[PDB]
Amino acid sequence: MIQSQINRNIRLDLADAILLSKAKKDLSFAEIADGTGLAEAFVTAALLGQQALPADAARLVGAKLDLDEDSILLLQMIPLRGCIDDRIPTDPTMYRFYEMLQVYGTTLKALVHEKFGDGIISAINFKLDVKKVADPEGGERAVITLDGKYGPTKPF
Amino acid sequence: MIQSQINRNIRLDLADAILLSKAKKDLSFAEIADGTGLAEAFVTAALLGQQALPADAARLVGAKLDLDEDSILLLQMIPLRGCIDDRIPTDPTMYRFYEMLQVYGTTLKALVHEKFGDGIISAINFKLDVKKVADPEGGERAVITLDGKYGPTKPF
Amino acid sequence: MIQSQINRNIRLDLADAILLSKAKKDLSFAEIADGTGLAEAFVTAALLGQQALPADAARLVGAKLDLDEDSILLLQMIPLRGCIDDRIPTDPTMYRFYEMLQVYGTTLKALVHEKFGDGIISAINFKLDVKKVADPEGGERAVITLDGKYGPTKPF
Amino acid sequence: MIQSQINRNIRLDLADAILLSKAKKDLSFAEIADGTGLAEAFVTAALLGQQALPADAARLVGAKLDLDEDSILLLQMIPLRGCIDDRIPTDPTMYRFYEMLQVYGTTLKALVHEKFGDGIISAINFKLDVKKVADPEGGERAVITLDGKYGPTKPF
Amino acid sequence: MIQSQINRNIRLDLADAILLSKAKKDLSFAEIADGTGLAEAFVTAALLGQQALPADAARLVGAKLDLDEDSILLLQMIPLRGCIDDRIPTDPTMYRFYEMLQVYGTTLKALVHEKFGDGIISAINFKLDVKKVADPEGGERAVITLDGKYGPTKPF
Amino acid sequence: MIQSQINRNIRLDLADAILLSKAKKDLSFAEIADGTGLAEAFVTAALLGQQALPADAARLVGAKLDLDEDSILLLQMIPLRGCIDDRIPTDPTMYRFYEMLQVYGTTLKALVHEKFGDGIISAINFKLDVKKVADPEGGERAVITLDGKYGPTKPF
Amino acid sequence: MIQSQINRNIRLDLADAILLSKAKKDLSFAEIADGTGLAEAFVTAALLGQQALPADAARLVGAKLDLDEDSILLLQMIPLRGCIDDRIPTDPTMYRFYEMLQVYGTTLKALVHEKFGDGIISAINFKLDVKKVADPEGGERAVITLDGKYGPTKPF
Amino acid sequence: MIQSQINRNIRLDLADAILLSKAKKDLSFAEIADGTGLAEAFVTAALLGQQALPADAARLVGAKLDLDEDSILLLQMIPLRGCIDDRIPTDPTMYRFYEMLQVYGTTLKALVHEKFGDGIISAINFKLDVKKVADPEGGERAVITLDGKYGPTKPF
Amino acid sequence: MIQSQINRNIRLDLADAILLSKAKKDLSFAEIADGTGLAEAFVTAALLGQQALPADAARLVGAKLDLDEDSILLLQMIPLRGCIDDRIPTDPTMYRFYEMLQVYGTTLKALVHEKFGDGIISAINFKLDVKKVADPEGGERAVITLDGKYGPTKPF
Amino acid sequence: MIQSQINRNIRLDLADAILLSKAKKDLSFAEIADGTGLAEAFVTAALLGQQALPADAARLVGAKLDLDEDSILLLQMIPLRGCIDDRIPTDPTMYRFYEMLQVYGTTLKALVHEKFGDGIISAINFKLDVKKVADPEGGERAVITLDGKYGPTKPF
Ligand SMILES: [Cl-]
Ligand SMILES: [Cl-]
Ligand SMILES: [Cl-]
Ligand SMILES: [Cl-]
Ligand SMILES: [Cl-]
Ligand SMILES: [Cl-]
Ligand SMILES: [Cl-]
Ligand SMILES: [Cl-]
Ligand SMILES: [Cl-]
Ligand SMILES: [Cl-]
């Protein structure tokens, strides 16, 4: 039977324990996700309390991190999502993505409406990936792809 | 000589005027950016108060929209950026992008650090584009590409 | 060509002007929406700045309320949605619906996950209606039906 | 003698404990409420700290979830209601209901006034239900009924 | 036909105009409410944007204050209630009532549950009045009576 | 020697403990206050962290509730007052009193100035009481009397 | 007949107008208050919208500043007090007084309780004054005296 | 070597421990400060986490309160100052001082500039004291003296 | 006679007008400050509403910018300082300096106390300068000097 | 393999423990950084939760402060940066730096754009240092150098 959470702190506290174990074993997120059949971004989000893992995935990652049974079960719960402590991130790495919204948010709105119509780009029927690409002028770039279904707003 | 703003309302007010003229002319953002030599997302952001236009681009969009001289000059000013009224968007279209951050912000941090290192993905050495694609299951998807330079944090 | 707004105040100001005209004409929302082929709740939301009217509906309500042509154009624009002044309503009538959320919000979450699965009930592929019904104890009850598409959360 | 709470955290902590036990026993809200005589939405709210259970109902769910005596007594206290952590939900599932208020809040006010009069729809003399119905276009919809008593404001 | 407002500023701007007129004419709230058949507290609230006046009363006070026809019509509209600028009053006079709530809010909850039961004391089926009474130790006291209908929580 | 607190959580945690004991003993606030020689509203406020009890009163209620010595001492400390978790109550019962302020706050100010003059109605030289009265139309009413000293504001 | 305000902006706009006139006439606050029979701090507070001037005082300062009749009448209105734009001052001069509260707030509470008892120091039965004193170490000191009536909190 | 704090909770937790000890020993702030060679307002602020004590004073109050060695050392650390829980005090005694700023803040600014010049009155080169005096009308008054260095603005 | 402001909006509106003039005349801040005797950062801050100009400087910049006489007088007013619209900047340029505080704020505190002692570094007895320096790795660096007086916190 | 944090409280709690050990040992930040090969400002930031230490430095400081192995590993984790408790500092020492931004933020933006162009001064490719100098008038000044890479905003 599906199970769900109502207070994010239980899974965020689990996330912290996970991260300590991960550090102690010197694991990467890529290796934790290996063997689950699920994308790195998805599995990582689950560990960090933002997604639910299927039972087999939860058992796999649970073994890798030496998690107790309650933790493995907690990983299967539908989370109370929301990773940002207090609405606006303080962390520079997280903050840049918020800044992308402060600069381009209305442009995204305008261009969504022009290209698709009234409605939204989904954050649920949605996937994300992060790719590293050499910058021709020197150094490295992140190409982050947000891929969401268009959901139209129609009269009724 | 470069000129900058300190109060977003001057350029946001201009944005409203631009949008009224745009609607009265039945123009698209694509048509407006055509011929400027600049990406639709960049020109649109400028119109909306979030970027500066080079003088030739400002004159051209100003011709297409019948803008007065002060307005064409204002478009060339470096803006006081920040498109969101009060930190968290109320508009569903804009809000979904903020929700992507509430769900995946910590995952983005974790994967940026694993793939690149301690530091940030730049919102300044940065570009974005919105592409409409088919959903294999039916309907349409937005593929929004965020492309930013990795800026490392190294000890001193 | 589709036209969108980025500052809610343009359409909220129009809403105030529409309400003054409506009051002067002693009109109801039911009669305004009559003949548009659209639901009362949708046409009302549009007048109040929260939905876009198709051109024919816009012209029709425009005639009923003696609106100028800038106003009839504005009603066709995709809004910058968000009717609540500052996050939490002050108005008792509006506040009670927010109280429903403070009391039953987590129960809605819990029951949605149990009955449907991980995911959301859409606010976009969505309709609502308000019905007045006798209370068996005397007085009257409102039966407000929220009817939203189940959007499943699917793992990638 | 009736007993009441003043700090939501006591019951919200109990809720988390109840959810862990529920998950360990692989129980549904439907099953837990069965035998209480009370609607699934009401019993669920109680478990989640938002309603009081009568003594016999408290004892029944207590036995089902292996709760201790203090916990069974706490479930009978009139709660300090308010399930939302910090005014605006972060969770996408809960957020959609808040968005419904950002879009339709003023429409609900207007239509309540037109259909009933000056006053409010109650969240306290109130019932909620969640039904799943097939969507004719494919997939599923939630039909959520908010049924509240109309309370008029009349002059004095 | 009933008419309603959605933006408090229209009626609050009217209130300021009413106050200037009232001051120019050196009138009291008592005098203004005389002849309306309505309590001084109710009429005063209406003038200040927090209640609607019936047509006859609107015309009466309108004549007293030399108000125009749009103003008299606006007083008849069901307001978007909420008199406090930004949630917590700054004015010492208004603040003391807020402080009463900070000191006795939980006591009021507890005693209401004890004396009446689970539910609320209505702010809608509600009257209030302000009386001046001599203080036996010297000076004067305000006896402010809040008189609301007990609305019991209805299980389901 | 008088003793005061600076951190509300200490007395609020005690309040939670008092309420558990109270519920275990199935006691009323009326009976707890019996024999203290003090008003139910004052004693209740003390238990809930918002007033200090005189030593004899503290010992009396402490005996009734089986409190330890640290607790009986804490009840005598002048509290760091403020019962509302985060400025605006979430609980419906408490919220109604806040709504009274949102609706009538400026009316209270206006009538206080008219009936008394410039200044305030005291929250300190102050008493309140809650009375249950039959409603002639059926059910019950709460008559809550706020009784405050007028403190004038005069030039210096 | 006493007259009162409910929106601070009316008197704060007047204040700005007063300050412009004052600057154009190169007047001091000391001189504006001379002949009024009222303290400099009181009259200044009134000009700045935080106190009300008696009629004679209003006419006197109004002639000095060349104010119109509506402005002189406004100065006589009981204000909606609250000079700080958004709770915490941004201005360094004003901020220091807020910092004094952040550093010594709990100390003031503690010493007030020790020296006087439970209750408050009045901000209404209150005066203040600002004196310049030479610092023996060089420069100048401000000696700002807050002088308020003790208001005891007693059991009832 | 000087030692400093970065999280106020360490010293505020210590403050609570100090106040419990102080209550158990029935001590006054005056008595605690006696023999330290420091003003009671300074010592009290240190106990409450808002100032640092020199070693000899720290050991002396530590003896009077039976504090352990880590606690005596903590008292010598430069604090992370800020006594107010969440910017605006809820406690009536503390709130009154905030209200003095809401009523007189702009007056203080204006009179500081007129009597001293552009700049600030220091909250650092600063002392304060609380004196109890007789009110000539009956009762008692607090004379609270804020004594700060004038810091002129330095053009460059 | 010294003159001061209480509402930042008066000088910020002047700042916007200044910036339009400056743009139209294609002037730099460097050149506007030339001949005033005041540092570019000081004169710029004045134009932007954060410092006062002496009369000669106000006349000089006034002539350069074609300002009217009221504007020239307003520049001499002691401002109500605070350039950030709503506490946390939205503009990326401004935000980076806030981020420096988010990352290094506690380090600055710690190293100020170790190097100087208990106290503060002044923003009032203060100078600022910005210098462009070649980056040896390519590009340019800003070397920004904050030079403030150390104000010790000593016991009393 | 790099390891990162998502909850600042883990490293901030470690910082508090570090500071206690540092006080007990009577150590300076200068001493602690000695022999790391890293600047005092960088190592201090690390201890305080705002930077990561390389493994060798982590072991060196860990030895000096008697930290356990989990603590030494924690210091090597990439932090969730953000040292300010709630956006605006309460601590006077920290606050002055925020006040530098309230006074000069818009000036910094303006001069950055004039001297460098559209874009930012980096908080990442960044360093800072704090220097103590004599003040010519007596006392001491802090010269704090911010040194950041210019990151241009260019069209695409
Ligand atoms: Cl990825
Ligand atoms: Cl694009
Ligand atoms: Cl409907
Ligand atoms: Cl249901
Ligand atoms: Cl009355
Ligand atoms: Cl009572
Ligand atoms: Cl004075
Ligand atoms: Cl003292
Ligand atoms: Cl410079
Ligand atoms: Cl340094």
CA gap J121, I144 in Å, rounded:
10
The residue assigned the tokens 């539908």 is A78
Chain B residues in contact with D102 (beta carbon < 8 A): 90, 92
Locate I105 and state its tokens. Answer: 């704020």
H28 is known as an active-site residue: no
With touching defined as 3 or more inter-chain CB pairs under 8 Å, the answer for chains F and G is: yes
- Is the Cβ pair A15, J5 closer than 8 Å? no
A31 is known as an active-site residue: no
Shared-domain flag, residues G6 and G65: yes
Shared-domain flag, residues H101 and H146: yes
- The DSSP code for G83 is -
Label each residue of H36-82 as H, E or C. CCCCHHHHHHHHCCCCCCCHHHHHHHHHHHCCCHHHHHHHCCECCCC
CA gap G92, H119 in Å, rounded:
8
How long a stretch of residues is chain C? Answer: 156
Task: Say how many Å lie between the CA of residue B143 and the centre of ligand 1.
Answer: 15
Q: Of H96, H99, H107, which is closest to G45 when you measure between CB atoms?
A: H107
**Number of Cβ atoms within 10 Å of the Cβ of C71:** 17
- Is the Cβ pair D92, A124 closer than 8 Å? yes
Shared-domain flag, residues J40 and J112: no
* CA atoms F23, F25, F30, F34: torsion sign: negative
Q: Which of C96, C137, C140, C141 is catalytic?
A: C96
Q: Coil, helix or strand for E133? A: strand
Shared-domain flag, residues A121 and A52: no
H122 phi and psi, to 5 degrees?
-65, 135
- Is the Cβ pair F156, G113 closer than 8 Å? no
- Is the Cβ pair B48, A111 closer than 8 Å? no
The residue assigned the tokens 């509470």 is G109
Amino acid at the residue E103? V
Shared-domain flag, residues B71 and B107: no
Q: What share of chain H is helix, strand, coil (3-state, %, to 5)?
A: 45, 20, 35
Locate J51 and state its tokens. Answer: 């930077």
Closest-CA residue of F relative to C101 is F90
CA gap C120, C113 in Å, rounded:
8
Cα B57–chain centre separation: 16
Q: Which of G96, G114, G137, G140 is catalytic?
A: G96
CB hemisphere CA count around G116 (13 angstroms): 31
- Is the Cβ pair B102, D88 closer than 8 Å? no
The residue assigned the tokens 């040992």 is J25
H helix or E strand, kind and range, residue F146: strand F140-152
Q: Of E82, E84, E148, which is closest to F141 when you measure between CB atoms?
A: E148
CA gap J48, J83 in Å, rounded:
8
* Mutation for F interface: E32, E87, E95, E111, most F CBs within 10 A: E111
Cα E90–chain centre separation: 18
CA gap I112, H58 in Å, rounded:
23
- The DSSP code for E53 is P
Task: Say how many Å lie between the CA of residue B19 and the centre of ligand 2.
Answer: 18
Closest-CA residue of E relative to G11 is E16
Q: Which of H71, H99, H137, H140 is catalytic?
A: H99
CA gap G111, G25 in Å, rounded:
46
Residues D2-37 as b/e (b if ≥16 CB within 10 A, e otherwise) read: bbbbbbbebbbebbbebbbebbeeebebeebbeebe
CA gap A8, C108 in Å, rounded:
16
In angstroms, the Cα distances linking F80 to D5, E108, F59, G35, G106 are 20, 19, 21, 44, 9
Contact C39, C127 (CB under 8 A): yes
Amino acid at the residue I51? Q
**Number of Cβ atoms within 10 Å of the Cβ of G7:** 18
H helix or E strand, kind and range, residue F122: strand F119-134
Q: Which of B88, B116, B133 is a domain's end point?
A: B88
- Is the Cβ pair J73, A16 closer than 8 Å? no
- Is the Cβ pair B124, J78 closer than 8 Å? no
Task: Say how many Å lie between the CA of residue I146 and the centre of ligand 10.
Answer: 13
Chain A residues in contact with B44 (beta carbon < 8 A): 107, 110-111
Task: Say how many Å lie between the CA of residue C140 and the centre of ligand 3.
Answer: 16
The verdict on F152 touching G (C-beta cutoff 8 Å) is yes
Domain count, chain J: 2
Contact C44, D111 (CB under 8 A): yes
How long a stretch of residues is chain H? Answer: 156
CATH number at residue I105: 3.30.1160.10
Q: Coil, helix or strand for I129? A: strand
Closest CA to E41 of F109, B98, D10: F109
Q: Going edge to edge, which strands form the sheet with I119-134?
A: I119-134, I140-152, J140-152, J119-134
Residues of F catalogued as catalytic: 96, 99, 122
Closest-CA residue of J relative to G100 is J92
Shared-domain flag, residues I8 and I59: yes
Locate F118 and state its tokens. Answer: 């410039």
Closest-CA residue of A relative to B134 is A149
Tell me the H-state helices in chain I: 8-24, 29-33, 40-47, 55-65, 69-76, 92-115
Shared-domain flag, residues C34 and C111: no
CA gap G8, H19 in Å, rounded:
41
Residue D143 pairs with which residues in a beta bridge? C147, D131
Closest CA to H116 of H148, H150, H149, H146: H150
With touching defined as 3 or more inter-chain CB pairs under 8 Å, the answer for chains D and G is: no
CA gap H92, I78 in Å, rounded:
34
Subunits with 3+ C-beta pairs closer than 8 A to J = A, B, G, H, I
DSSP chain D: ---B-S-HHHHHHHHHHHHHHHHHTT--HHHHHTTSSS-HHHHHHHHTTSSPPPHHHHHHHHHHTT--HHHHHHTTSBP-----SSSS--SHHHHHHHHHHHHHHHHHHHHHHHHT-SEEEEEEEEEEEEEEEE-TTSSEEEEEEEEEEEEE----
Task: Say how many Å lie between the CA of residue H39 and the centre of ligand 8.
Answer: 7
DSSP J124-142: EEEEEEEEEEE-TTSSEEE
Return the C-alpha torsion angle E48, E49, E55, E56, nearest 10.
Answer: -10
Amino acid at the residue F113? H
Locate H92 and state its tokens. Answer: 């009536």
Closest CA to E96 of G121, F105, G11: F105
Question: Which residues between 58 and 97 in chain J have a beta carbon less than 8 angstroms from any beta carbon of chain G?
Answer: 88, 90, 92, 95
Q: Which of J42, J71, J88 is a domain's end point?
A: J88
Residues D104-117 as b/e (b if ≥16 CB within 10 A, e otherwise) read: bbbbbbbbbbbbbe
CA gap B110, A45 in Å, rounded:
9
Closest CA to B95 of A121, A76, F75: A121
Q: Coil, helix or strand for A71? A: helix
In Å, how far is D106's CA from the nearest CA of chain E? 6
- The DSSP code for A78 is B
Closest-CA residue of G relative to F122 is G151
Q: Which of C88, C113, C141 is a domain's end point?
A: C88
Task: Say how many Å lie between the CA of residue I105 and the centre of ligand 7.
Answer: 37
H helix or E strand, kind and range, residue E92: helix E92-115
Shared-domain flag, residues B118 and B84: no
Cα G85–chain centre separation: 15
Residue C129 pairs with which residues in a beta bridge? C145
Contact B146, B125 (CB under 8 A): no
Shared-domain flag, residues B25 and B65: yes
Closest-CA residue of I relative to A101 is I90
Q: Which residues contact J82 (CB under 8 A, 6 or more apart)?
A: A89, A90, A91, I102, I103, J8
Contact B124, J120 (CB under 8 A): yes
Residue F142 pairs with which residues in a beta bridge? E148, F132
- The DSSP code for F5 is -
Closest CA to H91 of E142, E103, I91: E103
D41 phi and psi, to 5 degrees?
-65, -35
Closest CA to A94 of G38, B105, F17: B105
Amino acid at the residue A155? P
In angstroms, the Cα distances linking A124 to B97, B137, C29, F122, H36 are 11, 15, 35, 53, 64
Closest CA to D6 of E16, A23, F20, F113: F20
CA gap F29, E74 in Å, rounded:
47
CATH number at residue H24: 1.10.260.40
Locate F17 and state its tokens. Answer: 């403990």
**Number of Cβ atoms within 10 Å of the Cβ of A37:** 13
The residue assigned the tokens 């976009």 is C124
Q: Which residues contact J155 (CB under 8 A, 6 or more apart)?
A: B38, B39, B42, B51, B54
E31 phi and psi, to 5 degrees?
-70, -45
CA gap E22, E42 in Å, rounded:
17
**Number of Cβ atoms within 10 Å of the Cβ of G10:** 18
Chain H residues in contact with F84 (beta carbon < 8 A): 90
Contact J86, J59 (CB under 8 A): no
Contact E103, F78 (CB under 8 A): no
Shared-domain flag, residues J51 and J69: yes
Amino acid at the residue D33? A
Locate A5 and state its tokens. Answer: 């959470």
Cα H114–chain centre separation: 28
CA gap F53, F68 in Å, rounded:
15
In Å, how far is J52's CA from the nearest CA of chain G? 32
C56 burial type by CB count under 10 A (0-12 exposed, 13-18 middle, 19+ buried): exposed
Contact D29, C108 (CB under 8 A): no
Shared-domain flag, residues D156 and D143: yes
- Is the Cβ pair C6, A110 closer than 8 Å? yes
H helix or E strand, kind and range, residue C73: helix C69-76
Locate I107 and state its tokens. Answer: 């380090």
Strands F140-152 and E140-152: antiparallel
CA gap B78, E9 in Å, rounded:
34
- The DSSP code for E89 is -
Q: Which residues contact C133 (CB under 8 A, 6 or more apart)?
A: C140, C141, C142, C143
Closest CA to B64 of B25, B93, B94, B8: B25
CA gap A18, A71 in Å, rounded:
9
Contact J15, J49 (CB under 8 A): yes
- Is the Cβ pair E48, F140 closer than 8 Å? no
Q: Which residues surround ligand 3, an ion (CB under 5 A)?
A: C 40-41, 129-130
- Is the Cβ pair D84, F92 closer than 8 Å? no
For chain G, the first-to-last Cα distance in angstroms comes to 36
Contact G61, G34 (CB under 8 A): no
> What range defines the domain where residue H130 resides?
89-156
Locate J97 and state its tokens. Answer: 């730096």
Amino acid at the residue A3? Q
CB hemisphere CA count around F2 (13 angstroms): 16
Shared-domain flag, residues F81 and F14: yes
- Is the Cβ pair F155, G6 closer than 8 Å? no
Q: Which residues contact C27 (CB under 8 A, 6 or more apart)?
A: C64, C65, E1
H71 is known as an active-site residue: no
For chain C, the first-to-last Cα distance in angstroms comes to 35
H47 burial type by CB count under 10 A (0-12 exposed, 13-18 middle, 19+ buried): buried
H helix or E strand, kind and range, residue B47: helix B40-47
Interaxial angle between packed helices J55-64 and J40-47, expressed in degrees from 0 to 180 and rounded to the nearest 10: 70
Strands G140-152 and G119-134: antiparallel
A49 phi and psi, to 5 degrees?
85, 15
**Number of Cβ atoms within 10 Å of the Cβ of F120:** 28
- Is the Cβ pair C142, D128 closer than 8 Å? no
Interaxial angle between packed helices C55-64 and C69-76, expressed in degrees from 0 to 180 and rounded to the nearest 10: 140
Solved how? X-ray
CA gap A92, C54 in Å, rounded:
44
With touching defined as 3 or more inter-chain CB pairs under 8 Å, the answer for chains H and A is: no
CA gap F156, F153 in Å, rounded:
9
